[PDB]
Amino acid sequence: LIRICSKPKWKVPTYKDYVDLFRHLLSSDQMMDSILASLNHLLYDEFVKSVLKIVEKLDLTLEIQTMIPTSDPAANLHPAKPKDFSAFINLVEFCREILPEKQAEFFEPWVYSFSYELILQSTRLPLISGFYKLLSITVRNAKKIKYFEGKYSCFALFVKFGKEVAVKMKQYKDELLASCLTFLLSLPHNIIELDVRAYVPALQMAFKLGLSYTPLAEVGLNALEEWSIYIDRHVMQPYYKDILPCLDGYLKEVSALSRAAQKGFNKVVLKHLKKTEAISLEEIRIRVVQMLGSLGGQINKNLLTVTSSDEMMKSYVAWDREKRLSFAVPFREMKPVIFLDVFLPRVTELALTASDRQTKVAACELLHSMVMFMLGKATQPPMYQLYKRTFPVLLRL
Amino acid sequence: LHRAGLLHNILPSQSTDLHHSVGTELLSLVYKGIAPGPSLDLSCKQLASGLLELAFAFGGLCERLVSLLLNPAVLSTAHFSHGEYFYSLFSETINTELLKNLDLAVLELMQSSVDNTKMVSAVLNGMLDQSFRERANQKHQGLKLATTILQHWKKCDSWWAKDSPLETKMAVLALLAKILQIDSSVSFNTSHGSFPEVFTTYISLLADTKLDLHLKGQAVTLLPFFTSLTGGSLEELRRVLEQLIVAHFPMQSREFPPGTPRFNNYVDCMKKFLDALELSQSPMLLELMTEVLCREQQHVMEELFQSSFRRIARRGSCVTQVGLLESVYEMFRKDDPRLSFTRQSFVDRSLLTLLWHCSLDALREFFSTIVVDAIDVLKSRFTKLNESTFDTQITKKMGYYKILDVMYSRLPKDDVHAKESKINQVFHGSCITEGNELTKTLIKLCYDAFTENMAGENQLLERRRLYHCAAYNCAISVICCVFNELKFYQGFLFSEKPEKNLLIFENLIDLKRRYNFPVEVSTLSEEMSQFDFSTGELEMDELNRHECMAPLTALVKHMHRSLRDLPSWMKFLHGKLGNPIVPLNIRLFLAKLVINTEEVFRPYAKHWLSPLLQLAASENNGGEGIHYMV
Amino acid sequence: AQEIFQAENFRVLVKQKKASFEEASNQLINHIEQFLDTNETPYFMKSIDCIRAFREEAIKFSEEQRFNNFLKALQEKVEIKQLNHFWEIVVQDGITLITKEEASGSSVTAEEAKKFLADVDDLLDMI
């Protein structure tokens, strides 16, 4: 662990190919020792003790380095001992692929401890992901095996920490927030049916933050699926008119193999294919409609009862009462007058939300040009109502 | 409560012995509970560790704990230790109680050394790596327990004696390496620890011809702790190292195929010697290592030796630097009847590296020591009636020329030009006579070399050729650091006179060796340290290899940046390349030299086409010709 | 078808045992020559032990020509070089040719030991 978690011409693969080794050390085990003369349990327990040891001694704390960030994760996103930090990271993914499974009976006694000190560290090391990720691993292992049929000490621990992290999460940005959300939406929660009004913002932020980060969409989908299929079908109902309407935006060359295929097919395509897991968004939409029909038509109508218009009308109204920004595009002899307003909304939202670097750059250049245009135009037309629309986007940009 | 000290007036001992009955019963429970009457978990271990922490929080109980560690009872299981298991199970709270009170835990532990040697070694080693682990804020118990387990070394004595189990000798070597690594550099003087009785152990484990080579390779890592000794003890240690070398080392060279079960042992022992020597900048380690190195045509590990010497010289502590320099120097300068080849090897591949990589930024020390001891031998006159002494004088003169070359190539100009102290000791003592006195004396005696004719000389021809080459290299180095502004490079290094058979290039070039010329050519790296602790240019083909091509090319490029043709280097080499009556090899050499210095001969193109062209085009070149040279 | 499918311990051992001969003699000659080239006293005791072993094996293997040729060669070498220390350590013990009858074997006292071993100048100041 200490080494293969420390590895960050000569080529150095870091940890991603130690993984199958360790999986066969414990899981693919009866198929390799049968030629010899159990070890699965001992090695799993040793791996968990060792990872607990490393978490105990890594000094994962952070220090501020030379404004005033309100973001608690800030320039402070800089550990004191970066080699330790990278070691913890290699640790978190290594455990993540070593511990989705092999829990058939092995993780049964480790849940309470593993949790308890992950909560303890993550409470004094709050803004350090991977703690959350190990928590989500251990809670999903506590979910595969049942472990939550009512021990009760860890139940109260998870309840209190779920509440605390769900309230602290409303500050966290991309990687931290993603780890927190995957944690929260991995509680069994067919066992915590209670206070479901505090776990809904963590599912609509894991839906809204989807559409770009597919595994967050996947965790949101499994969350909603479990909440539908196992929670009681009278309290899950009032919390459909605000959990489906955030799920609507989802519903919107010459290689070696090619040369081998061109030159007949004699053992060359075989070797070329023999030489050669992010979820696909299309399958995400497929599952959205699948469970959208699987949840009925009684429940279903809430997908589009958001308000039928709440703030997209702010994008569907005239930014100004009467048009300004008359721009005479100069041809040879005629010079006709176009209006920049009409496409100012689409440009100003292409600048912010583009998901396309070339389109983003073009849109930002247009907002620059149009901003200068509109500050010029009033210099020689009362026009502040479009400043009121366009400064809240200059500051965002 | 124990943090508040109210552990006894809230839980007492009865009208019994001064020991705490509660602690005794708790510790007995923890000892015989994990024993069968079994099963184990992590929470149980957390309890039991807290339980025995409580047990030790009462009072002393330490001698009882130790007696439990050495208790030789046997627990059967298909029957391993029954007393070690209690240790390895906890192994951390145990050892932080033993390090709670020193001088008694260690004493009571080592007292039964001959009885439970496995157990006493295990517990002492655990105490050691426990204390090494906590040195960041507590590098105090480490020193105390190291010194304390040294103060009783005469008790743990049967371990290193002769005909012991040849597993406890290396066990005590590992323990002893641990001890020395913990404490400071203290165990050598005025019997700080047990000076006599601990050296006797090192000398004995590195002495007797019943141990192995890897065992002493482990042993020769104590050396960086023990090379700072002095006359008696250091002389004895150097003696025993020398019998090690004579008794287990290959006699002059490899003579071992790579893979036989001597070559691997030899390379292991040698590299351990070498990295020890790179740790402790110890002169006599250089004596031994150069001695073995410069004793064959070319050692197998030459590059290792050279990198080691590069580190050695590059250390600081200039007095130690000068000591290494003077040590290898005196190893060469001495009148020992050594072979000429070996003696000249001493300077070639041992002390030139040390001189190149560190002497001093404005050095005086070594050169000032050797000025009027090497000048006088350069002025010495040969006696061509005996092969041996003549050869040795040639080799020593060559070496002195090479050393002067190194200083003049490295030492800045001023502290050899100006009215100095580094210089003023060839003539009239350190008085202010004229300045630049040894510049001109060395110039005379060097130019008089490599220009002395060889008509009547038919005894040692290759050696004298190398003598001339080294002299000429020394000359080139000094002239690059003479005033060197006007036509100085011409009178010497060039412009000889064949009236009385002065031939620079004819004599240093071989002229009878037929060149072949083939056609073409941190808090987690710390836990690395605790596991460490508790475990143990050009194409140098056939005529760039002439010991004058690289110096001559550097000199030519230097003259390019220093001021038809130019008087006697453009023109004298021009006229020695032109006519095909000059012997072939000089002409090949000058072609090589002009090739490597092409950038110099770009303004002089119109002069420099005829002789190169006729050298390529002529038919004089042997074999199928100088084809890659063409 | 039927025709296509139907170190010192090793040196001590070398000095002791050798299938061939006069090659070990040559290699030990080279070894002692290089040992005498250097001047470590342990190598001097090495040489004296080696010559003692050679004398013992010559006596125990019916051979004297090698012994006397080796003795003559080493005597000439010490005479022509500066190996006074080597000769001193040899005469401290005493090594001499066969003195019985100048042949293989006899029962005569040793007497051979006592009977044989009792212009350019102007170029300078232009600066």
Side-chain angles (χ1 to χ4, degrees), chain A residues 1-6 8-39 41-44 47-62 64-66 68-82 84-100 104 106-159 161-167 169-196 198-320 322-397, chain B residues 1-78 80-81 83-90 92-99 101-161 163-196 198-277 279-295 297-316 318-364 366-399 401-421 423-432 435-451 453-456 458-461 463-473 475-482 485-486 488-498 501-563 565-570 572-630, chain C residues 1-17 19-59 62 64-98 100-118 120-127:
Chain A
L1 267 292
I2 304 311
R3 280 75 177 272
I4 73 172
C5 284
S6 179
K9 69 158 295 308
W10 208 258
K11 59 97 177 178
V12 181
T14 69
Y15 69 93
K16 296 91 173 165
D17 44 351
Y18 295 104
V19 167
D20 55 336
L21 156 68
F22 263 80
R23 300 194 297 187
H24 313 334
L25 296 178
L26 61 83
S27 51
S28 160
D29 207 358
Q30 321 314 113
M31 65 184 73
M32 41 198 307
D33 57 5
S34 52
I35 75 180
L36 314 168
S38 296
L39 211 63
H41 199 92
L42 189 77
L43 269 161
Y44 195 99
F47 183 43
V48 176
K49 299 197 290 285
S50 47
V51 62
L52 284 191
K53 286 182 244 172
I54 312 172
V55 188
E56 180 67 89
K57 43 185 205 304
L58 276 188
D59 189 21
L60 305 203
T61 76
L62 311 183
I64 188 64
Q65 194 171 358
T66 71
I68 298 89
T70 314
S71 179
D72 276 4
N76 186 256
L77 189 54
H78 283 347
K81 301 177 178 31
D84 292 330
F85 207 51
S86 59
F88 183 42
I89 291 186
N90 300 124
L91 184 148
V92 301
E93 291 83 4
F94 194 21
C95 299
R96 176 170 313 110
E97 185 172 0
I98 301 299
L99 306 178
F106 288 161
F107 208 70
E108 181 65 26
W110 287 96
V111 182
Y112 172 48
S113 49
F114 213 78
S115 64
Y116 178 67
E117 68 274 15
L118 295 166
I119 296 89
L120 262 56
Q121 274 313 315
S122 51
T123 300
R124 291 189 296 272
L125 295 182
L127 72 165
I128 294 288
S129 81
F131 282 145
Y132 292 129
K133 284 151 175 150
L134 269 292
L135 275 181
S136 65
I137 290 148
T138 180
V139 75
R140 285 177 213 166
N141 284 274
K143 258 159 61 185
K144 199 209 305 168
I145 301 299
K146 296 325 293 169
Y147 197 78
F148 277 96
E149 273 55 30
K151 186 180 289 293
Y152 292 166
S153 308
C154 83
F155 197 113
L157 192 52
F158 275 127
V159 176
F161 190 44
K163 294 298 296 295
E164 291 293 328
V165 75
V167 187
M169 182 179 72
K170 292 132 59 170
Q171 308 314 109
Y172 298 171
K173 305 304 206 251
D174 51 353
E175 79 289 324
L176 194 54
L177 175 77
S179 44
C180 306
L181 296 163
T182 62
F183 169 58
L184 287 181
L185 301 177
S186 64
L187 303 160
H189 196 276
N190 55 349
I191 309 300
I192 316 184
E193 290 88 1
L194 69 89
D195 195 358
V196 75
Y199 300 106
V200 288
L203 185 49
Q204 61 203 57
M205 261 196 288
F207 277 133
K208 193 261 290 174
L209 289 177
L211 302 158
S212 302
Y213 182 76
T214 307
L216 215 57
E218 180 58 38
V219 64
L221 267 291
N222 318 128
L224 189 38
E225 183 160 16
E226 296 292 328
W227 297 17
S228 86
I229 199 165
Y230 281 135
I231 292 187
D232 186 18
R233 191 183 270 91
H234 295 285
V235 298
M236 189 69 263
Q237 189 266 328
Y239 307 103
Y240 277 148
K241 56 171 302 314
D242 62 358
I243 195 168
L244 277 296
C246 46
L247 182 73
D248 66 349
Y250 277 55
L251 311 178
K252 276 170 180 54
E253 174 56 64
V254 189
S255 64
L257 178 136
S258 50
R259 305 196 291 176
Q262 187 53 259
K263 305 175 213 185
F265 320 95
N266 291 319
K267 275 73 67 179
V268 297
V269 286
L270 275 297
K271 58 175 68 65
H272 276 145
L273 192 42
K274 194 49 210 172
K275 187 255 289 180
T276 74
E277 262 296 323
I279 301 299
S280 68
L281 184 57
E282 58 256 57
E283 204 173 49
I284 301 299
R285 281 75 177 272
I286 286 175
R287 219 198 280 191
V288 169
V289 303
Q290 273 264 0
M291 68 174 289
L292 193 64
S294 300
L295 61 83
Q298 284 254 23
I299 297 169
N300 217 355
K301 305 302 211 43
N302 310 129
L303 185 148
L304 61 84
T305 65
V306 61
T307 61
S308 294
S309 78
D310 206 309
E311 74 266 6
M312 72 290 291
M313 281 306 248
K314 305 169 181 52
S315 80
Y316 284 147
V317 293
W319 276 23
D320 203 351
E322 179 57 36
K323 318 183 63 72
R324 290 88 171 94
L325 273 77
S326 75
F327 169 54
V329 55
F331 295 132
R332 281 86 165 91
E333 94 298 344
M334 64 185 289
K335 196 197 297 182
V337 163
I338 312 313
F339 299 119
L340 299 171
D341 309 339
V342 298
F343 44 84
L344 184 60
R346 187 49 202 246
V347 175
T348 188
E349 66 183 1
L350 270 170
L352 309 164
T353 74
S355 79
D356 179 19
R357 279 193 173 272
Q358 213 194 310
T359 307
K360 190 165 179 71
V361 176
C364 295
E365 293 173 349
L366 274 181
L367 276 174
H368 196 148
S369 309
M370 291 189 238
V371 160
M372 311 296 208
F373 184 86
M374 53 175 313
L375 57 82
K377 295 299 295 297
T379 309
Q380 76 174 39
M383 71 76 58
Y384 64 92
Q385 319 209 320
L386 189 153
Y387 282 151
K388 297 165 112 67
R389 293 305 320 250
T390 197
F391 279 159
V393 55
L394 272 293
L395 316 165
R396 303 258 159 164
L397 263 180
Chain B
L1 272 296
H2 180 232
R3 184 178 295 115
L6 268 63
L7 181 46
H8 300 299
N9 56 5
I10 321 291
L11 272 195
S13 297
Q14 308 90 27
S15 293
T16 54
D17 48 349
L18 275 190
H19 312 90
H20 209 298
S21 64
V22 184
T24 54
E25 58 89 21
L26 268 184
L27 187 153
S28 78
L29 170 55
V30 170
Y31 179 91
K32 65 179 73 175
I34 301 299
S39 179
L40 183 63
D41 202 43
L42 73 164
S43 281
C44 65
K45 286 177 59 64
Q46 183 62 255
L47 289 176
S49 84
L51 287 178
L52 61 83
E53 208 283 342
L54 181 64
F56 311 146
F58 277 135
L61 204 63
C62 286
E63 63 181 356
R64 173 83 173 97
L65 171 52
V66 176
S67 56
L68 269 192
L69 277 296
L70 308 159
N71 189 358
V74 167
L75 294 174
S76 71
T77 294
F80 62 95
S81 83
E84 212 290 334
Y85 174 35
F86 173 65
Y87 185 42
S88 84
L89 191 73
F90 290 111
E92 208 276 346
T93 55
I94 299 304
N95 294 315
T96 187
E97 182 65 26
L98 282 72
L99 282 71
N101 48 340
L102 302 166
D103 186 80
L104 187 139
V106 300
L107 158 63
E108 271 275 90
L109 183 62
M110 268 146 278
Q111 173 75 300
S112 175
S113 288
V114 181
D115 176 332
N116 290 138
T117 183
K118 204 171 309 181
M119 281 307 310
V120 65
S121 78
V123 187
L124 210 46
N125 190 354
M127 271 205 268
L128 261 177
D129 63 358
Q130 178 92 34
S131 181
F132 175 77
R133 215 177 281 129
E134 188 200 355
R135 60 186 137 75
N137 296 338
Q138 207 56 256
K139 185 93 153 167
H140 311 73
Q141 301 304 279
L143 319 173
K144 304 212 63 52
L145 62 83
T147 69
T148 313
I149 62 180
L150 286 178
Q151 291 146 35
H152 298 93
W153 191 278
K154 276 77 70 177
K155 186 62 67 70
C156 56
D157 204 89
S158 159
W159 294 355
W160 60 248
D163 58 67
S164 292
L166 71 165
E167 285 85 60
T168 54
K169 285 177 189 175
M170 65 179 288
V172 56
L173 272 190
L175 167 55
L176 165 74
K178 284 201 168 74
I179 297 169
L180 315 175
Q181 177 141 337
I182 301 297
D183 73 350
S184 163
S185 69
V186 292
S187 83
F188 44 80
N189 47 355
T190 317
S191 303
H192 171 278
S194 177
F195 169 74
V198 69
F199 291 95
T200 44
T201 70
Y202 304 97
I203 308 314
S204 311
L205 291 175
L206 272 172
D208 198 88
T209 303
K210 78 168 66 180
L211 293 84
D212 298 334
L213 284 173
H214 50 277
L215 190 154
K216 313 211 169 190
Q218 181 72 9
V220 298
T221 304
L222 64 93
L223 292 183
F225 301 123
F226 286 139
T227 56
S228 183
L229 270 60
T230 55
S233 44
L234 188 153
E235 207 272 331
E236 193 63 83
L237 157 66
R238 286 320 194 265
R239 182 173 340 289
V240 74
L241 268 178
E242 283 157 13
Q243 289 87 20
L244 181 62
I245 301 299
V246 65
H248 284 293
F249 264 50
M251 283 73 74
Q252 70 274 16
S253 171
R254 311 164 291 106
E255 289 88 7
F256 291 166
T260 192
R262 292 96 65 198
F263 165 91
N264 316 309
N265 279 292
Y266 182 43
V267 182
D268 190 15
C269 198
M270 261 305 317
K271 185 47 162 54
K272 276 157 155 25
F273 268 108
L274 193 149
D275 186 74
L277 155 68
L279 288 171
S280 71
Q281 294 82 18
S282 182
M284 223 73 69
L285 271 177
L286 264 180
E287 269 79 352
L288 294 176
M289 275 319 95
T290 51
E291 163 64 281
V292 54
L293 162 71
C294 317
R295 185 179 67 189
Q297 58 88 31
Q298 181 255 144
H299 206 269
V300 56
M301 311 185 258
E302 174 79 32
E303 49 277 9
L304 287 163
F305 276 90
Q306 298 302 317
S307 43
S308 88
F309 299 165
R310 292 187 264 288
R311 273 86 60 86
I312 293 171
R314 291 177 64 189
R315 208 44 76 90
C318 309
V319 62
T320 61
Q321 294 194 355
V322 180
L324 308 154
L325 270 58
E326 297 196 47
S327 66
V328 56
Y329 168 88
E330 197 45 59
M331 188 199 328
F332 149 76
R333 174 280 191 290
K334 72 175 169 294
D335 63 358
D336 195 75
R338 272 223 183 86
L339 183 62
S340 54
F341 173 71
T342 285
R343 176 181 275 131
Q344 65 93 32
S345 298
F346 289 158
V347 57
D348 277 330
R349 45 174 174 161
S350 315
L351 68 87
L352 295 176
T353 300
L354 295 152
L355 266 170
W356 272 108
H357 296 305
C358 292
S359 76
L360 180 59
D361 51 6
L363 180 70
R364 301 171 295 169
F366 183 49
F367 189 29
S368 60
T369 52
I370 313 302
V371 162
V372 64
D373 302 290
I375 288 282
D376 185 20
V377 61
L378 289 186
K379 315 260 197 189
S380 63
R381 311 261 74 76
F382 300 101
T383 185
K384 321 177 298 174
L385 61 90
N386 174 217
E387 321 295 329
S388 313
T389 178
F390 181 45
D391 192 357
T392 64
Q393 202 152 359
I394 292 174
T395 62
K396 192 182 291 186
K397 279 202 186 208
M398 194 196 318
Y401 284 127
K402 289 159 165 202
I403 308 169
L404 270 291
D405 166 65
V406 186
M407 283 74 74
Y408 268 111
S409 315
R410 296 203 56 194
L411 288 180
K413 66 185 290 293
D414 56 2
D415 44 0
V416 181
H417 294 285
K419 297 302 306 199
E420 270 298 336
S421 295
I423 64 155
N424 51 3
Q425 61 183 355
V426 184
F427 291 165
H428 292 88
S430 66
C431 69
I432 297 91
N436 307 61
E437 297 86 339
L438 66 84
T439 79
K440 64 182 294 293
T441 61
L442 183 62
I443 277 178
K444 273 201 285 294
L445 59 92
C446 79
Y447 191 88
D448 285 346
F450 71 79
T451 61
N453 73 346
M454 296 269 298
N458 203 80
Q459 287 183 354
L460 276 300
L461 277 296
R463 301 295 309 158
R464 280 190 264 200
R465 200 191 71 75
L466 297 152
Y467 172 57
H468 295 306
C469 295
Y472 184 70
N473 297 115
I476 297 197
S477 45
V478 307
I479 292 290
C480 295
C481 293
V482 298
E485 299 312 306
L486 58 92
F488 284 126
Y489 314 83
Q490 293 77 344
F492 317 113
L493 280 58
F494 302 124
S495 297
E496 67 279 21
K497 64 83 171 183
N501 214 4
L502 282 72
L503 311 186
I504 302 181
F505 276 100
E506 191 275 0
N507 200 359
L508 58 83
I509 305 296
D510 183 270
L511 303 200
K512 264 152 91 183
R513 193 267 298 275
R514 180 253 181 204
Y515 301 145
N516 211 345
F517 292 166
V519 61
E520 187 44 50
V521 305
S522 188
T523 311
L524 185 139
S525 85
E526 184 157 301
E527 270 78 7
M528 281 309 211
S529 65
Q530 292 83 18
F531 194 66
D532 216 0
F533 184 97
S534 66
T535 300
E537 276 267 357
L538 282 74
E539 190 65 33
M540 186 64 72
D541 48 22
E542 294 294 328
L543 269 167
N544 292 323
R545 304 201 291 101
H546 182 269
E547 75 254 18
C548 289
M549 190 78 40
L552 264 174
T553 51
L555 160 77
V556 166
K557 304 197 197 59
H558 163 52
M559 292 188 268
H560 204 81
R561 48 178 164 271
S562 82
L563 281 73
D565 283 329
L566 302 180
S568 68
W569 64 287
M570 281 305 198
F572 181 76
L573 307 185
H574 200 313
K576 243 174 181 173
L577 194 68
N579 53 359
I581 179 66
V582 170
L584 181 43
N585 277 336
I586 312 184
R587 207 159 58 239
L588 286 174
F589 178 98
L590 298 155
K592 280 302 299 184
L593 162 57
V594 64
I595 284 174
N596 302 333
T597 45
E598 177 267 323
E599 319 80 0
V600 179
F601 305 79
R602 181 166 292 166
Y604 290 71
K606 67 182 290 294
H607 299 258
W608 288 108
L609 192 148
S610 179
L612 309 160
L613 163 72
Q614 56 166 114
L615 178 82
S618 46
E619 175 43 61
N620 57 5
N621 286 293
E624 68 92 17
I626 58 164
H627 205 252
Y628 71 92
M629 193 47 170
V630 172
Chain C
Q2 261 178 0
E3 286 263 20
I4 191 168
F5 284 121
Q6 197 47 46
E8 289 325 307
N9 52 0
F10 305 108
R11 275 308 167 267
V12 170
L13 183 65
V14 160
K15 293 183 278 288
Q16 202 264 342
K17 185 70 204 152
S20 180
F21 190 70
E22 290 275 351
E23 64 154 6
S25 172
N26 207 0
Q27 80 203 46
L28 63 87
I29 282 292
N30 298 120
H31 301 151
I32 65 155
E33 265 300 323
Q34 69 197 3
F35 289 168
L36 294 169
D37 176 69
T38 191
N39 291 105
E40 279 82 4
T41 50
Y43 282 118
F44 294 148
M45 283 74 74
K46 223 181 202 200
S47 307
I48 194 66
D49 292 330
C50 284
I51 180 63
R52 274 308 183 88
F54 307 150
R55 193 257 298 165
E56 290 292 331
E57 69 196 86
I59 293 175
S62 77
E64 274 296 322
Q65 66 276 16
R66 184 255 294 167
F67 171 62
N68 57 60
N69 293 335
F70 182 24
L71 214 61
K72 287 178 193 288
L74 67 92
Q75 284 153 342
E76 185 70 27
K77 286 309 290 181
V78 303
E79 278 313 295
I80 65 184
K81 284 186 176 178
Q82 53 254 200
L83 274 297
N84 50 358
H85 289 75
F86 175 55
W87 202 234
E88 192 268 333
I89 73 171
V90 165
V91 306
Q92 185 62 256
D93 278 335
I95 318 290
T96 304
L97 286 84
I98 176 65
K100 300 200 278 272
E101 66 167 37
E102 288 101 359
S104 296
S106 287
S107 67
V108 185
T109 185
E111 64 92 20
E112 283 198 0
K114 298 297 115 178
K115 93 171 178 202
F116 194 75
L117 185 62
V120 297
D121 296 331
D122 194 0
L123 311 180
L124 302 165
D125 55 314
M126 293 177 70
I127 205 174

